[PDB]
Amino acid sequence: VLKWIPRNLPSCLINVESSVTSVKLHPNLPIVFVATDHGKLYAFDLFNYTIPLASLQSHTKAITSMDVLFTNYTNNYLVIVTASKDLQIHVFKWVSEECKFQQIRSLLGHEHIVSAVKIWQKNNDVHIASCSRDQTVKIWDFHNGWSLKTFQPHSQWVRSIDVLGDYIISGSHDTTLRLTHWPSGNGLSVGTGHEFPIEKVKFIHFIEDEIRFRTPSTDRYKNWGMQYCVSASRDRTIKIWEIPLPTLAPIPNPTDSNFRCVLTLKGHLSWVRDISIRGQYLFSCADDKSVRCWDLNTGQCLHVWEKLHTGFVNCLDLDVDFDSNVTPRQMMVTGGLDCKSNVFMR
């Protein structure tokens, strides 16, 4: 149920007026979300692609990334947050009765182009993460409407981030990664080994089901929360990084302030644009009009999906399996610069 591999040909083709920059899968109902270089935010279902569910132009420029989440409360809706090149972040409300888009509010404050967005829920509290060319990651509060933390984890500008509880890792333009503890806002470790700027970085979430890189090593490091982080850059490589253990407000160890080359992998002909984790397999694409599936165990490209897009292919993602509230269904969507998108079913 977790070893699903996509076929060699998509069953549906999505036509978009402009290039697709980001996609996201609805964890509950079969609806995929489509970007637009013109700045539109589409809504497409997996059975009738001939007509959009909704469409609007709220951004004067193209968008960079999208993310969704269905919140839970022990005391219930899907929230859409989108960042664009118009110096603003727009948070949208997705209704299910009439299946339209509703605008909640717009976030301002970033000095230049915002690029990545992360959303998480913990202790019945939700926040929105954000990084831009202002070389500062800014995490804001959805309910309060004000920022909660702002710090500089890199000399140059940060392109991609991810959040796992109280830790956040940043991917910048200067070929180095920085792990920072969010409530304290201090750097912990640095990672060298890259020669080209990072495109997207995310954690290797712990799963329980025998994957080498998705299991803890020792009891204390199991209690740390996470072991590995996966990062893709423009040197056509995706690198797996071993996080050193800090002094545990964590304190950086002077003798353990450097990362380690757990596993580096090659095989892409151009800049690896995105990464995703599903079971023992890692999915990725690049500018070489190809989609891959790299096994975490042997570190070898199992399947090559060649020439799915005439131009560049930008975005792909899977369903989250580490979260109990989200069922990891066997849906895959890929979006490309050729103004077309491919969705894989079964």
Binding site: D86, L87, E195, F196, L269
Partner: protein, 975 residues
């Protein structure tokens, strides 16, 4: 082992020369080696000196300006001053050998002596020298001297005194024979082809083919054609190294792939520097003959060989279309990330990107981009460096600078390359070399892997401290000074690639750059030259295919095939492209440019101006026709309703008969003006962008040329064309006249060019210094007057661009290179904000910021970098201006009342005509937005009153005509 420069193949001649060179060293006798470039003097002495543990090599390269202090600076890091004075080497066992390359290069003074030659003969004959700062005699004890030189018959080589060569044994080395070259390079090709055992039997034909190609290139391309057509075995070693690199970083090869790869390497080694297309075709036929006679495969032209490692993990030939699309997407990303430029990519650009990338991948890989200005030298260098991840360092050399700023910039660049291991591309323009000491620094940096002059003394000590700290950071075990400095120079050689940009190779400074011995034998000369007409066709089609083009009838003319360089004519787009290319060729031919490279900046500027002007004019014409059509339809509907079915409506209908007639006439002439819209748009664009630096006579001549060439390609234009009537609006005309323009149409035309240049900053060449006052009246108190010759000008300009005030910079012939990023309009858009880099710190652009450059010196000195980007406009007085000014002066000093009445009447008449034109505009707007009848009647009555006033005012013109006829003799004698 091909990449290692210390490898030799022992032949008879090599071992003979090496043994006698070693014997002459061991005799404590001076040695001077004479031979043509590439003979192998450096090779034999390096070979003879690695096989000895008793001698050490110090490498000095002499240029046109080398002094004694350079020879001293190259040795103080190698030698210790001891008082036993005595200048001993730092080592106690090994001796020292002073390789002085190109001894003939240092020049004579005005009294026929060379300083360094006399210093060397003092070093050998007298065994020492007098230390200048404290006047003491230091005795050289264990330093030998080795000279390498070329025969004096070569150009740039000057005779050497016999008092020097008395003490120096002389050996002559000629070029190796063809058989020896074939043997040596079949050994090289066997070493290369060890990687491919399937084709190990083709080594000898490949080597003989390479040697034959070398001999035919050396015979055909001699110095008599071009000053840099110097070929040597070093070219063939570079060919071999490129072949090895492309084999090593490539896939499994076939025999056809080997032929194509070797041919591409030969193209990039031999035919990079070829200027004329005839020599390129000669090299193509020579390659065909060499392949046919030696290695018995498709077309082997330069553009048909596109080898690249961008599209895969290995170096291999790629298709054209996928490479073009990949480069277009990468360049869009580059414009999004580093700097935004409106550049479209063509095939020769793709080839230039490939060869620049090929050179930049190499260790110790430099460039000399020779070609016209605005060709794409530095922008493609930056793009290739961004693809490779290199760091761009453009030196901040400006006016009021000296060697100290260049030394600090190069020191910081070397420190970043070595200590910080930051891979760096260093781009040197021809305008960044102010003095010949700049060339000395560049030559020392390229010949060796350092500059010993900068880092000497306490600078040497802090270098040692920094390098020990960095090496201890990297965990490398080394203690000696020699190993540490070898690591230093290895890091410098590995992580630094100097790229040279030359715009005018005929200039003396650029000739010194090209003819420099270390800038020639180490760099990779890349003579791109002026754009060929195929490139112009590609860029022109690619930049006019995005506009609404086909909206009128077109008949393809029957023209000669030879004059058409584009695809066969099928619509007006190819006709427009051919017209623009042909006019560029004719303009550059008539200006007597000679063999000088021709800048395509005029062509690109005219293309962009045509695009924007035809867009604006078509929008305006479509809007005007829509308004006229809906007004006529509304009038017809109202007339039909009145006929089918009260006094005010009837009066309005009857009074608007003239407007209906005018609307019908404009509707009838819409077809005529749509026929001629493309033609006069082309004429206006070219007339704005090409004729800015021209006088009236040649402007009229080239306008006749443009009209004839436009009628040749069946593109219609306006027979009664006039640029003032087509661009200069009446509101702008009155604003300019009240701002202080002359009544001459030449000056209004020039200012119309000045204001209608929103992309390029205008150059105001006004000797009378009147345009400064005019523009100061134009922008009111917002304007500011700066100067290149004043102090604190940088801060004034920065404050002016923060506030957004309009800037006029005086003294344009003293151009300051710090504003070069403002000149090329390199703007970084910070979201809604625009920022630019001036000097050393970035500054914001407000949006209402305008830049003007003024110069009152005719026949001044405008650099080609400044010349190629600015809309240079001459303001030179002529016939009509003299006549008008003399007439005005004599009227003012004879009868001022009549002159005042005449000028007031002219101003009132033109104001009344403007009010009339705005009034018909108001009637058209009111009828388009359909109380109203009473307002229309009032406006019609106002029009009638103003027309009657003008008719009454037009009764004094014959008196002015009589005054003109009376004072025309005074005017013509004045002129």
């Amino acid at each position: 082992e091909v990449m290692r420069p210390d490898i030799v193949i022992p032949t008879i001649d090599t071992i003979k020369h090496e043994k006698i060179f070693y014997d002459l060293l061991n005799s404590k006798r001076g040695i001077i080696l004479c031979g043509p470039p590439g003979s192998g003097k450096t090779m034999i002495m390096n070979n003879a000196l690695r096989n000895s543990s008793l001698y050490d090599v110090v490498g000095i390269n002499f240029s046109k300006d080398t002094t004694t202090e350079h020879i001293l600076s190259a040795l103080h890091r190698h030698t210790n001053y001891v008082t036993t004075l005595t200048l001993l080497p730092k080592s106690d066992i090994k001796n020292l050998v002073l390789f002085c390359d190109e001894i003939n290069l240092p020049k004579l003074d005005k009294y026929g002596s060379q300083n360094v030659v006399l210093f060397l003969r003092q070093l050998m004959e007298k065994q020492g020298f007098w230390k200048t700062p404290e006047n003491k005699w230091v005795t050289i004890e264990r330093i030998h001297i080795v000279g390498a030189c070329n025969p004096p018959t070569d150009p740039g080589r000057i005779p050497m005194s016999e008092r020097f060569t008395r003490h120096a044994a002389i050996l002559y080395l000629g070029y190796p024979s063809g058989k020896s070259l074939s043997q040596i390079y079949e050994i090289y090709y066997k070493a290369i082809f060890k990687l491919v055992p399937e084709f190990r039997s083709y080594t000898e034909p490949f080597a003989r083919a390479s040697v034959h190609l070398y001999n035919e290139c050396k015979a055909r391309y001699s110095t008599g054609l071009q000053s840099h057509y110097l070929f040597s075995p070093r070219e063939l070693t570079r060919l071999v190294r490129g072949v090895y690199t492309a084999i090593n970083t490539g896939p499994r090869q076939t025999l056809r792939s080997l032929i194509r790869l070797w041919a591409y390497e030969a193209w990039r080694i031999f035919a990079d520097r070829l200027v004329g297309v005839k020599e390129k075709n000669s090299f193509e036929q020579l390659l065909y003959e060499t392949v046919d006679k030696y290695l018995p495969l498709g077309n082997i032209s330069s553009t048909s060989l596109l080898f690249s490692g961008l599209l895969s993990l290995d170096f291999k030939e790629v298709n054209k279309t996928d490479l073009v699309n990949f480069i277009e997407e990468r360049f869009k990303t580059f414009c999004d990330e580093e700097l935004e430029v409106p550049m479209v990519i063509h095939e020769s650009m793709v080839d230039h990107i490939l060869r620049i990338d090929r050179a930049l991948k190499q260790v110790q890989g430099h460039m000399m981009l020779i070609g016209a200005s605005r060709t794409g030298k530095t922008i493609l260098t930056r793009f290739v460096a961004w693809l490779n991840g290199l760091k761009i360092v453009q030196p901040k050399i400006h006016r009021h600078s000296n060697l100290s700023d260049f030394d600090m910039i190069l020191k910081k660049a070397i420190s970043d390359c070595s200590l910080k291991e930051s891979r760096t591309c260093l781009i040197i323009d021809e305008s960044n070399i102010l003095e010949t000491a700049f060339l000395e620094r560049m030559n020392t940096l390229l010949a060796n892997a350092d500059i010993p002059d900068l880092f000497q003394g306490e600078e040497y000590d802090k270098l040692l401290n920094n390098l020990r700290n960095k090496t201890r950071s990297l965990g490398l075990l080394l203690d000696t000074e020699q190993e540490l400095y070898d690591w230093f120079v290895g890091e410098i050689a590995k992580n630094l690639h100097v790229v040279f940009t030359i715009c005018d190779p005929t200039n003396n400074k650029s000739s010194a750059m090209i003819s420099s011995p270390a800038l020639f034998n180490r760099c990779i000369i890349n003579w791109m030259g002026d754009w060929d007409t195929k490139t112009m066709s590609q860029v022109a089609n690619n930049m006019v295919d995005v506009v609404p083009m086909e909206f009128t009838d077109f008949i393809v003319p029957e023209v000669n095939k030879e004059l058409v360089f584009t695809e066969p004519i099928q619509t007006i787009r190819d006709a427009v492209v051919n017209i623009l290319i042909h006019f560029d060729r004719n303009f550059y031919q008539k200006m007597k440019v000679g063999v000088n490279p021709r800048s395509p900046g005029y062509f690109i500027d005219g293309l962009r101006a045509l695009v924007k002007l035809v867009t604006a004019k078509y929008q305006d014409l479509q809007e005007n026709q829509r308004f006229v059509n809906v007004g006529l339809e509304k009038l017809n509907e109202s007339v039909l309703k009145v006929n089918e079915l009260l006094d005010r409506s009837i009066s309005l209908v009857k009074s608007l008969t003239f407007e209906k007639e005018r609307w019908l006439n404009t509707t009838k002439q819409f077809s005529k003006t749509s026929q001629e819209l493309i033609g006069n748009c082309i004429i206006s664009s070219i007339y704005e962008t090409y004729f800015g630096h021209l006088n009236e006579r040649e402007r009229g001549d080239m306008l006749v040329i443009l009209k004839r060439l436009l009628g040749k390609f069946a593109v219609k234009y306006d027979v009664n064309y006039r640029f003032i009537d087509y661009l200069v609006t009446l509101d702008e005309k009155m604003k300019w006249l009240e701002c202080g323009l002359d009544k001459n149409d030449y000056f209004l035309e020039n200012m119309s060019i000045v204001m209608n240049s929103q992309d390029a900053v205008p150059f105001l060449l006004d000797p009378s210094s009147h345009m400064i006052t005019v523009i100061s009246n134009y922008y009111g108190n917002k304007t500011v007057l700066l100067s290149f010759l004043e102090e604190g000008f940088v801060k004034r300009l920065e404050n002016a661009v923060r506030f957004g005030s309009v800037v006029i910079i005086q003294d344009g012939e003293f151009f300051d290179p710090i504003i070069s990023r403002l000149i090329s309009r390199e703007f970084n858009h910070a979201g809604n904000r625009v920022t630019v880099e001036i000097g050393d710190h970035e500054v914001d652009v407000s949006g209402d910021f305008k830049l003007f450059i003024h110069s009152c010196d005719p026949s001044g000195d405008i650099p080609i970098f400044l010349r190629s980007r600015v809309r240079l406009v001459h303001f030179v007085t002529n016939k009509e201006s003299i006549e008008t000014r003399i007439f005005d002066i004599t009227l003012t000093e004879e009868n001022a009342e009549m002159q005042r009445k005449r000028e007031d009447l002219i101003k009132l008449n033109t104001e009344y005509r403007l009010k009339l034109k705005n009034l018909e505009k108001r009637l058209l707007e009111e009828l388009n937005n359909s109380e109203l009848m009473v307002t229309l009647n009032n406006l019609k009555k106002e029009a009638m009153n103003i027309e009657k006033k003008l008719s009454e005012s037009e009764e004094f013109f014959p008196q002015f005509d009589n005054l003109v006829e009376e004072y025309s003799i005074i005017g013509k004698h004045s002129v």
